[PDB]
């Protein structure tokens, strides 16, 4: 059981050892297409590459590469696309992927500039009168509206294919206070955000997989996806306590390398699932408590 395990590891002070065991047991698959010379400028980091078997392929005959992976969680019946923060030359590819994969939501867990360094490109328009045209892929992106909160921002974007004139509404969920290789302020602030993404309809199987990213799209992204998947599993299993977080993370790591980058991010995933379990059990009032403790207003 996860709660008794959490307390046992917290008392022993063995979080570093538990996380190092997951890293040792983690899958190792080829990333041949990612390491190809022509794809060097399409990768933000040399040590973060998608596996060939799970990589997302663009529908262009020229070069189908994008540093993105499809996490297919079979039992939980949910899929996520984890990608890197797009580079100045891959912003068109990013939106081409969103279009082709029919994604309705994009979850951003980082900031454009963290500690005076560019971690992600400004891939979306900041002003509504200033739309962005990606000439390479023939796509137009316009900011419709934005709801700014204390630690997160929800944006309504319009994505248009200029060849067909087809229009789609994309929701952009931006967590603005999650530092690199860090954890959120509290389980309440994380869960309030996760449930806002859930209630929007962006995670529905009627749409394509949600795009989740950070700078590399492995650390903060892995924490978000692990918490979401573990909460989904304890709803349909009829035995909530049968969910093993470490096993779910190893299953996720079969699709993209290095999901969850620190021992504290793993510990936080436990805290997030234990606190989130209260809502899944039937107590509706805990969602209202998360809204108060998150300090969104």
């Amino acid at each position: 059981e996860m709660e008794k395990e959490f307390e046992q590891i917290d008392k022993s002070g063995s979080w570093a050892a538990i996380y190092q065991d997951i890293r040792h047991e983690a899958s190792d698959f080829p990333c041949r297409v990612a390491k190809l010379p022509k794809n060097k400028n399409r990768n933000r980091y040399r040590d973060v590459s998608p596996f060939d078997h799970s990589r997302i392929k663009l529908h262009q005959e020229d070069n189908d590469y994008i540093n993105a992976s499809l996490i297919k969680m079979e039992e939980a019946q949910r899929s996520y696309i984890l990608t890197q923060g797009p580079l100045p030359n891959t912003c068109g590819h990013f939106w081409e992927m969103v279009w082709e994969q029919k994604s309705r939501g994009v979850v951003m867990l980082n900031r454009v500039m963290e500690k005076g360094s560019l971690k992600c490109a400004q891939y979306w328009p900041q002003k509504e009168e200033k739309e962005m045209i990606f000439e390479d892929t023939n796509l137009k992106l316009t900011l419709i509206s934005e709801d700014i909160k204390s630690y997160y921002t929800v944006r309504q974007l319009e994505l248009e294919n200029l060849t067909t004139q087809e229009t789609r509404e994309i929701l952009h969920f931006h967590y603005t206070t999650w530092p690199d290789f860090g954890v959120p302020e509290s389980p309440a602030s994380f869960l309030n955000f996760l449930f806002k993404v859930r209630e929007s309809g962006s995670l529905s199987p009627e749409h394509g997989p949600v795009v989740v990213h950070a700078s590399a799209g492995i650390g903060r992204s892995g924490t978000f996806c692990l918490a979401d998947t573990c909460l989904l599993l304890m709803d349909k299993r009829k035995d909530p306590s049968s969910v093993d977080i470490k096993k779910v993370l190893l299953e996720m790591r079969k699709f993209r390398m290095g999901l969850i980058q620190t021992a504290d991010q793993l510990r936080f995933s436990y805290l997030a699932v234990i606190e989130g379990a209260k809502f899944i059990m039937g107590d509706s009032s805990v969602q209202d408590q998360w809204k108060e403790l998150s300090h969104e207003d």
Partner: peptide, 6 residues
């Protein structure tokens, strides 16, 4: 930097 894994 061109590395993420520290």
């Amino acid at each position: 930097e061109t590395d993420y894994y520290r």
